[PDB]
Scaffold this active site. Structure first.
Site: not given
Ligand code: HEM
Ligand code: HEM
Ligand SMILES: CCCCCCCCO[C@@H]1O[C@H](CO)[C@@H](O)[C@H](O)[C@H]1O
Lengths: 49, 101, 421, 55, 443, 220, 54
Positions: E59-60, E136
């Protein structure tokens, strides 16, 4: 971080019917509770007597 | 005919709370409705009610009453809480009716 | 029938009525008003904040209890949004309940009773409401920003100052409503309703006479500098200059310059290349940061500049870098294609803004309030792209030359003062 | 005042604070059982005693 | 125009399947702006002990550039057209979507396909994001609410796949290989398991056309077009208590096993949750709120906030509530919360459901407030129900619900069940499992 | 000292130099009284230009000398008095630090009259910068200054502080006659100059209270 | 606690019911029978035991 946290393994304690991780535990729930409550209900009978 | 006024004035005087300097409203039993109403009273009206009550309790303990010239007069009695209390009860009834609805 | 008209009457007393049927299963009515902390004076500071929270108190037509129970009874909602200069009271609910919900919206805006006791009980809430709002540093610096940018009106804080929590009176709430919630300063906007219906409600129920009530003092620019040393690892800073006000060809210039400089991210975790400002700061510092073009347009003024967020030690460089990007832009450093791209993002943004009921309704009423009209989404686009590369560069110059005001909070040990920029 | 009677009532409050919500060490052994047994002998003795006393 | 009529006059949702197995659906409106994206039936649940946190790692990179167009090029192109590129990865569902001008629906579709099919997976970008992700994880570790829900899954589904978090482990993130991410993508981002959804001012046929042009790469074998059924995740009545009296407030989450997407009972559970609702210290409504629990919270200052939930999944789910309270009011809160759950199963009123139903309707209508939210519904719906469900159908189902139904369904999933509990923060006042377990009957 | 003091020698970490900003902080807190101070970089400790400000301080008004009595010998007070009818207070502010100093005036007035009171105090400074200082004014102020200093040392706390203060910033001790000798040897010019340095220098201001009528530094 | 009359678990009880107990300033003789009833009880028990012993 909390991501690195996981619940330990309780296989040395689980009732036979919820030992397998890929099986719904609800199917044996009524039996598991029926039994335990059966003991309690019986103890209440002996006590009432 | 003005029969009430005759009666209500007699009763007021017969009751006698006015001998202690208390208004009619000063003598109400503090149930839930009254307690709520009291919290809505303006500062001064509240502090005034307090003095009248403390003073009356001091009279009650002393077993004296106020000199006849200080007794509240039937027509000068202030119904300071009645308006509040009525709103309070009305609101309560509204909630009650509504919670059955 | 997705081709309905956006009607918009305007009663004799000045009340504006704008409706629009989109046949959506949900209606969202609102009462826009020209009110806010802007109209407060030293004596009644924060009174507009408390008034915002007083929406659920009892009115002459409905009790605090029924207002909440009533609206909830039909899955409806009631909220109040406000800026330094405008207050919006809107309610949302399913179509078949607009009549129901309306009674309440009405009572709240026109028949408040501000009972002494209910008010006394509510004031401590100002602390709470304010405490949660201030969790975002963003809010704190913007408050100080307006306090440094102006000497009056707009300088007033959006949240009730602390020394006044508990001191606002019912009198002040009444007088504020009386002197500001006037038919000529209000607007009844609605969506998912039929103009004839909304129009009918207005003329029949909205009362509180017309007039402009007390007029606000003019906004005087100060160009001050407020620094809040609070030790946070991150330093938030905003530098601005007096910009264009609401309704101005100048406005569009800044909007475009805004998007040319960098007006927020468009790619998740992605870098902003089309952002002159961001890209510039990025070249200056290695650490996590955030820079953006700031821009506000008020009735009689506006503010324009940039807002940064950086590690304390690199605040200096990050803020200066953002400054050069503004000079560099004031000195023709603006491509003609840059202005083209920004114009798209601007047109796009605006267009997306209206996708949600809250956005559409706010767009309609906002304009329907400051000019009882409605610009076609084509005229607005027509007005935007019709902005030369020159205009933009000028906007940029107006900034570099204008007197600036600044506000920063955090471990300001390395944050520069306005006179070192 | 309190949402649940077990805590507000002036009598239950007492039962709750000594036999229901009373904080107890997690590891006390069988040796901590004689207090309650002593209490039960007491009630048992009194009951049987009255019964005997009546004849 | 009545609520009913407006529900019937809503444009229908068109669906068409390509030969490769991909499904293309969209709802048409007259909006100059639109949202389109691909909803993949992938997520942490599909990962295992070795590749946990891969779908997240991916997703990154899904936005850092493709083969046809490196990073800068990719970004500039999207930025310069005023389009918004967002997306997310969860336990059973992933998504990558774009907000743009209907006028670009086709170029976007090309972009989407390029992202899901030809991600550059730059060897150097990978090591770079490896550090970003690690930051994160520390940021999210301070998000009690999310730490609490992770823990709730960690114990409620201990031993299974739903026990894992979406972001993954620290060891995985420190050692995931360019090959692992690649493997992940090839294994999961597959036509039959994806859904091209779009909403706004777009031609279904133009959408499906660009779709045919860019979403090609058909499969040969049978193993490539079959959607794998995941192994069941066992639910376990249990608790995990992470205590830290240094934290200002405490978070508590209690839940029973839910039915799973396809089950109709979910409409009832959502009505039920609607009765209890939610709350937080800024609900002007205050002490007059319809939700009894909310009312008590205000009167007794039981919490800072609370919320009910009915999280679904393919074959299971979590039905419960979560609250935040001061260390000294946890017990009364839990007491009242469980009390209300008992009330549901036992004494629900017609009035109660009447309200909850209205509340639920306006809630479903709210989740279709914009092109992105509507697009999300489509993606999710086809991916979970294999078909879109109109607001009119929902309303049809919601309308059938009555007090008796709420009681039986609630009694069914709640009464005398062994819950899953997650408590974080200054939780000393929260009584033991046995005490809580008793709050599960009589009420 | 010698046989016991062990934490040893060095100049330790030296402080950063004091950089002047000339900012303006306003605390709106609603008090009926508004306190305000306007200053300019003044003289440093030992700075020759110190005595000049000290004298100008006493010439403008450096505190009351008569209980409940008006201060006539106070240019500043007398001026503000002429401007407002309500209770107030004005004084010459003055601080001397190692590498800098501050000089100006401090007021206290009802909120509504803060504007006039502050402006009045400003004119008294200009009016002084423009030779509006008698030669006798400088003579009187020099007495109050010599007096004050002399009284300051009556109490043990004051005497000790005087000794040590100097014995620290120069390991010496000026005779109370040299200090007096240095003070009166201050021309009327010096004072007027000090006064000018203020009106021309960049000013910094701080005020708190109901500042609704308090002027901003750029309106002075 | 600085004074035993309040900290001690037993005195605390005597203090809160017979020493620091807040009482209305104006209660009359009609409020005396509560304590008198208490004393009858103690008196009756004491004389009853003595009689029971014979
Ligand atoms: C602390 C509790 C008590 C203890 C330790 C206790 C112990 C005893 C003992 C050792 C005996 C003699 C038993 C025997 O006959 O060999 C006895 C007799 C007796 N006790 Fe108790 N007793 C208790 C309470 C009571 C109470 C409360 C009553 C009456 C209200 C009572 C009434 C009697 C009577 C009437 C006898 C005579 C009949 C008999 O000897 O069996 N006792 N008790
Ligand atoms: C509430 C307190 C009490 C009351 C109202 C009470 C009342 C009475 C009454 C009405 C009599 C009859 C008196 C007569 O002979 O005319 C009596 C007899 C007796 N009471 Fe009590 N009594 C009380 C407490 C006690 C206690 C605690 C005991 C013993 C531990 C006790 C032991 C006796 C005995 C042995 C007699 C018989 C001797 C006699 O009749 O004088 N009493 N009591
Ligand atoms: C010594 C005289 C006692 C008279 C009995 C009054 C009853 O009972 C109450 O219980 C509380 C908790 O244990 C105590 O703190 C109070 O002091 C006590 O009055």
């Amino acid at each position: 971080v909390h991501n690195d946290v996981t619940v330990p393994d309780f296989s040395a304690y689980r009732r036979e019917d919820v030992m397998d991780a890929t099986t719904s535990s609800q199917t044996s729930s009524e039996d598991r509770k029926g039994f335990s409550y059966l003991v309690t209900a019986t103890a209440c009978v002996a006590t009432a007597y | 005919g003005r029969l009430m006024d005759r009666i209500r004035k007699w009763y007021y005087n017969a009751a006698g709370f006015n001998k202690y300097g208390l208004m009619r409203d000063d003598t109400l039993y503090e149930d839930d409705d009254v307690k709520e109403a009291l919290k809505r009273l303006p500062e001064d009206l509240y502090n005034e009610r307090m003095f009248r009550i403390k003073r009356a309790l001091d009279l009650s303990l002393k077993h004296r009453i106020l000199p006849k010239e200080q007794w509240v007069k039937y027509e000068e009695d202030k119904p300071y809480l009645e308006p509040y209390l009525k709103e309070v009860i009305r609101e309560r009834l509204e909630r009650e009716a509504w919670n059955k609805k | 029938p997705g081709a309905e008209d956006l009607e918009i009457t305007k009663l004799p007393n000045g009340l504006i009525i704008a409706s629009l049927e989109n046949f959506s299963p949900a209606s969202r009515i609102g009462v826009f008003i020209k009110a806010g902390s802007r109209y407060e004076t030293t004596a009644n500071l924060g009174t507009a904040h408390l008034l915002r929270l007083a929406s659920p108190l009892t009115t002459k037509g409905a009790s605090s209890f029924r207002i909440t129970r009533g609206i909830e009874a039909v899955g409806g909602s009631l909220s109040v949004y406000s800026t330094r200069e405008k207050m919006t009271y809107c309610v949302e609910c399913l179509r078949d309940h607009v009549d129901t919900v309306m009674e309440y919206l009405l009572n709240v805006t026109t028949a408040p009773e501000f009972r002494p006791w209910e008010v006394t009980d509510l004031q401590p809430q100002l602390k709470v409401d304010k405490a949660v709002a201030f969790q975002s540093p963003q809010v704190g610096v913007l408050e100080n920003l307006h306090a440094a940018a102006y000497k009056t009106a707009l300088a007033n804080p959006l949240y009730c100052p602390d020394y006044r929590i508990g001191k606002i009176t019912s009198e002040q709430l009444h007088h504020f409503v009386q002197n500001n919630f006037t038919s000529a300063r209000m607007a009844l906007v609605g969506i998912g309703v039929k103009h004839s219906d909304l129009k009918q409600v207005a003329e029949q129920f909205l009362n509180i006479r017309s007039g402009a009530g007390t007029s606000s003092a003019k906004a005087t620019y100060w160009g001050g500098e407020i620094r809040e040393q609070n030790g946070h690892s991150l330093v938030h800073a905003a530098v601005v200059t007096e910009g264009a006000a609401v309704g101005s060809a100048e406005a569009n210039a800044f909007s475009v310059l805004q998007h040319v400089l960098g007006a927020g991210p468009l790619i998740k975790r992605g870098s902003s290349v089309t952002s002159k400002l961001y890209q510039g700061v990025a070249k200056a510092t290695t650490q996590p940061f955030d820079a953006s073009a700031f821009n506000v347009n008020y009735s009689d003024s506006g503010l324009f500049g940039f807002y940064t967020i950086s590690q304390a030690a690199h605040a200096g460089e990050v803020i200066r870098a953002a400054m050069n990007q503004l000079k560099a832009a004031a000195q023709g450093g603006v491509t003609e294609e840059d202005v083209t791209k920004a114009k798209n993002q601007l047109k796009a943004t605006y267009l997306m803004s209206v996708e949600t009921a809250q956005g559409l309704l706010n767009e309609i009423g906002s304009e329907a309030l400051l000019s009882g009209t409605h610009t076609a989404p084509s005229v607005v686009a027509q007005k935007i792209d019709s902005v030369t590369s020159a205009d933009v560069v000028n906007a940029a110059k107006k900034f570099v030359s204008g007197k600036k005001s600044m506000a920063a909070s955090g471990d300001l040990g390395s944050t520069p003062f306005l006179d070192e920029l | 005042m309190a949402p649940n009677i077990r805590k507000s009532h002036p009598l239950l409050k007492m039962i709750n604070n000594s036999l229901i919500d009373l904080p107890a060490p997690s590891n006390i052994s069988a040796w901590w059982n004689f207090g309650s047994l002593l209490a039960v002998c007491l009630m048992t003795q009194i009951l049987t005693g009255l019964l005997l006393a009546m004849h | 125009a009545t609520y009913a009529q407006t529900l019937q006059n809503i444009p229908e949702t068109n669906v068409t399947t390509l030969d490769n197995g991909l499904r293309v659906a969209s709802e048409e409106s007259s909006q100059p702006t639109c949202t389109v994206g691909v909803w993949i039936g992938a997520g942490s649940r599909y990962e295992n002990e070795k590749n946990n946190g891969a779908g997240y790692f991916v997703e990154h990179l899904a936005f850092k550039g493709t083969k046809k167009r490196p990073c800068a090029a990719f970004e500039k192109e999207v930025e310069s057209m005023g389009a918004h590129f967002n997306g997310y990865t969860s336990r059973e569902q992933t998504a990558f979507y774009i907000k743009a001008l209907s006028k670009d629906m086709p170029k976007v579709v090309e972009l989407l396909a390029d992202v899901v099919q030809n991600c550059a997976l730059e060897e150097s970008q990978i090591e770079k994001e490896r550090g970003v992700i690690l930051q994160e994880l520390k940021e999210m570790d301070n998000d009690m609410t999310n730490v609490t829900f992770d823990y709730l899954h960690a114990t409620a589904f201990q031993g299974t796949a739903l026990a894992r978090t979406v972001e993954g482990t620290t060891e995985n993130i420190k050692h995931l290989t360019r090959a692992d991410l690649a493997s992940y993508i090839d294994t999961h981002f597959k036509a039959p398991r994806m859904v091209l959804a779009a909403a706004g001012g777009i031609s279904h046929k133009e959408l499906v056309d660009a779709a045919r042009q860019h979403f090609s790469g058909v499969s040969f074998t049978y193993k490539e077009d079959a959607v794998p059924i995941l192994p069941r995740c066992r639910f376990t009545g249990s608790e995990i208590r992470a205590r830290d009296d240094a934290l200002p407030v405490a978070h508590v989450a209690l839940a029973v096993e839910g039915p799973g997407w396809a089950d109709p009972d979910n409409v009832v559970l959502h009505v039920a949750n609607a009765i209890i609702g939610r709350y937080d210290r800024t609900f002007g409504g205050g002490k007059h709120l319809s939700s009894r629990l909310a009312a008590l919270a205000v009167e007794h200052k039981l919490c800072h906030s609370f919320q009910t939930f009915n999280t679904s999944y393919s074959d299971t789910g979590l039905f419960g509530f979560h609250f935040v309270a001061d260390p000294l009011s946890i017990d009364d809160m839990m007491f009242c919360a469980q009390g209300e759950w008992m009330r549901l199963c036992t004494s629900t009123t017609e009035s109660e459901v009447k309200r909850a139903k209205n509340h639920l309707r306006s809630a479903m209508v709210a989740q279709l407030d914009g092109t992105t939210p509507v697009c999300e519904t489509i993606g999710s719906h086809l991916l979970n129900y294999g078909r879109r469900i109109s607001l009119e159908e929902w309303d049809s189902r919601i309308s059938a619900v009555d007090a008796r139904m709420v009681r039986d369904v609630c009694s069914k999933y709640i009464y005398d069940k062994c819950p899953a509990l997650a408590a974080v923060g200054p939780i000393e006042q929260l009584l033991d499992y046995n005490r809580i377990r008793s709050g599960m009957y009589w009420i």
